[PDB]
Amino acid sequence: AGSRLETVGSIFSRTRDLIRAGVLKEKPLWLDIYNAFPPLREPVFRRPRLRYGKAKAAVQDIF
Amino acid sequence: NDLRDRILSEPLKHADFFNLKELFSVRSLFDARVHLGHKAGCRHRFMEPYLFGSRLGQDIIDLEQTAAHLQLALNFTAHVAYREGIILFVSRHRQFAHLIETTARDCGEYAHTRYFKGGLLTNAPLLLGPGVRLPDLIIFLHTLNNVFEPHVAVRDAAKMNIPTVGIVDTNCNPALITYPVPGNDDSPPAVRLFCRLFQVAISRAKEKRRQVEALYRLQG
Amino acid sequence: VQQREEWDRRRKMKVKRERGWSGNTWGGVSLGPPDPGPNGETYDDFDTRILEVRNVFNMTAKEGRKRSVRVLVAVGNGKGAAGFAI
Ligand SMILES: [Mg+2]
Ligand SMILES: [Mg+2]
């Protein structure tokens, strides 16, 4: 029917893999738009780790 | 059938098919207070690349990256509307709930600014009905609920493979949002501008779908 | 009387189930294709196997020991797509 794992990868990655596998025989309508127009960053799940140690932020002050 | 394939695949060959580049500009966004953000203390870790800088402890969002993201977001929104797609407006914020609800009515699309039930998008057959067509796109005008946690629809939509176009503030999590648009979601002028931009984007997509249909009808 | 005797002979015999990992455990026993989905989709290429069946007890105020059975199965079509759930 589909894949409901959030952390495996982007929605695009799972959809095209299931279609290539042969389980999803009806291509979703939004898939064609995604191939023609991809976003700047692929939506891959990442854990928001907290910064420890001497590492600081790279944001510069506006002066 | 072949002409049905032709009309579906026609707008895919033009990047500026809907001529959305004239709707907004850097100056237009700047006057809407879209470059402002929360304090430096609330800066989420994933929003660091999208921040131009911090002005006296107040983060400033880089509108140049906002314009690049917003251009794709509006372009992606129109195409899924062109193909007769269901669009849902989700925003759990008790200051623009009526405005967003009225915005969807004018565009003819659906809105859900009320309390979000747990098993709505996942356990759809029990909540709504036996056979229900899931929305093909979700728009988040606010990715946070009233308790400053990420909205449930953001996580559920990724489970159901539904693309989400959501405005992310400086304290949001754009990790699961496929088309993030870093901007300001608190000032009334900013929220009003985003709704109007999505109003014209949907209306143009609905109209230009009808115009090409008329041309197809007279083709044969 | 012959009919009743024949009926008894057709009840003693038991079907020999698919041999799993051992003679008595359920590890490796197939359950056939998964049930069709609510949309009418049919999955006959998928096959499922049982990996672990274990009785689980919980303490309740009234009954006492509330025995519950949990299982962990994996499904797959043989073309590269597979999954697991409990
Ligand atoms: Mg905010
Ligand atoms: Mg034995």
Side-chain angles (χ1 to χ4, degrees):
Chain A
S3 183
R4 300 181 181 179
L5 295 99
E6 319 160 3
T7 67
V8 164
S10 64
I11 46 184
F12 170 71
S13 61
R14 295 189 299 270
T15 43
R16 69 174 178 90
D17 287 335
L18 265 62
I19 290 184
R20 186 175 58 179
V23 54
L24 187 56
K25 301 182 178 181
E26 189 178 6
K27 179 166 56 58
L29 52 91
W30 63 269
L31 181 60
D32 296 323
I33 310 176
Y34 197 95
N35 293 119
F37 305 139
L40 265 64
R41 172 186 176 271
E42 180 172 330
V44 181
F45 184 86
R46 294 192 300 105
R47 186 63 56 182
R49 303 297 181 181
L50 217 166
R51 200 178 309 272
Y52 289 100
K54 296 182 183 300
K56 268 72 176 183
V59 180
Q60 57 182 2
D61 300 331
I62 307 300
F63 286 139
Chain B
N1 300 330
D2 299 327
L3 279 70
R4 303 180 180 272
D5 201 318
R6 167 66 66 177
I7 183 175
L8 292 177
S9 60
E10 174 185 357
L12 303 179
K13 298 176 298 181
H14 309 76
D16 54 354
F17 186 88
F18 293 91
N19 298 327
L20 304 178
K21 302 184 177 182
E22 57 183 359
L23 294 176
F24 66 101
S25 183
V26 185
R27 171 57 62 174
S28 179
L29 297 177
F30 192 95
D31 294 338
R33 312 171 190 177
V34 192
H35 71 272
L36 280 75
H38 299 271
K39 289 290 186 176
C42 304
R43 172 194 314 164
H44 197 256
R45 189 187 183 185
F46 288 167
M47 296 300 302
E48 289 174 327
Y50 300 112
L51 289 183
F52 175 78
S54 58
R55 176 65 179 181
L56 301 181
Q58 182 178 359
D59 292 338
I60 299 299
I61 306 177
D62 195 3
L63 284 186
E64 293 290 342
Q65 291 171 325
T66 297
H69 289 80
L70 184 55
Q71 185 65 28
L72 291 182
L74 299 182
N75 183 24
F76 186 84
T77 306
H79 275 74
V80 74
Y82 176 89
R83 304 169 67 103
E84 293 287 341
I86 293 175
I87 291 190
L88 185 67
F89 282 76
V90 174
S91 174
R92 186 57 181 177
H93 191 173
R94 301 177 65 261
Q95 194 190 9
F96 312 99
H98 186 70
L99 184 142
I100 298 163
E101 209 161 352
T102 55
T103 284
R105 195 183 79 264
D106 299 336
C107 306
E109 293 301 321
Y110 317 92
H112 187 172
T113 176
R114 317 300 301 187
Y115 168 69
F116 202 94
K117 309 184 72 177
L120 188 63
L121 295 183
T122 311
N123 192 15
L126 269 66
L127 261 294
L128 305 183
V132 181
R133 201 172 91 89
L134 305 176
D136 298 330
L137 176 130
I138 298 182
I139 293 181
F140 290 105
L141 298 186
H142 297 84
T143 66
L144 302 175
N145 49 25
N146 289 326
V147 299
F148 298 85
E149 282 186 353
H151 202 277
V152 183
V154 169
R155 206 191 78 261
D156 270 359
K159 305 185 67 63
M160 304 304 299
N161 309 331
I162 301 177
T164 60
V165 173
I167 284 84
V168 283
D169 199 352
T170 192
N171 73 326
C172 300
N173 185 28
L176 295 89
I177 303 183
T178 176
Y179 288 102
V181 180
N184 174 29
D185 60 351
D186 298 326
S187 52
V191 183
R192 288 208 290 260
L193 180 138
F194 280 98
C195 297
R196 197 193 73 256
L197 261 61
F198 283 103
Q199 275 192 12
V200 293
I202 296 306
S203 66
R204 288 190 180 184
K206 297 286 293 183
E207 291 293 335
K208 289 190 178 179
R209 178 54 146 81
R210 185 169 292 100
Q211 306 300 142
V212 179
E213 274 288 342
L215 188 146
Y216 157 81
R217 292 160 183 176
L218 58 90
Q219 277 176 331
Chain C
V1 294
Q2 297 300 329
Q3 184 70 17
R4 301 180 182 179
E5 296 169 1
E6 157 262 339
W7 281 336
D8 294 334
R9 197 185 74 261
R10 297 187 180 182
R11 190 184 299 103
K12 312 169 187 177
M13 300 298 105
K14 188 57 181 181
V15 184
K16 305 297 296 182
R17 72 184 195 185
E18 292 181 347
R19 181 97 66 83
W21 294 341
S22 304
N24 212 326
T25 185
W26 291 90
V29 179
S30 63
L31 302 174
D35 297 328
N39 298 329
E41 48 195 2
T42 301
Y43 300 123
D44 291 341
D45 51 358
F46 282 89
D47 196 338
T48 182
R49 300 284 186 173
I50 297 181
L51 298 187
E52 177 192 30
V53 47
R54 176 180 298 182
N55 299 335
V56 161
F57 292 88
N58 182 21
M59 188 58 59
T60 58
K62 298 186 177 184
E63 301 188 1
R65 300 183 187 178
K66 180 181 177 61
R67 170 179 173 270
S68 299
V69 173
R70 79 164 190 177
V71 292
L72 185 147
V73 309
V75 296
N77 53 17
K79 302 303 177 182
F84 76 106
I86 183 178

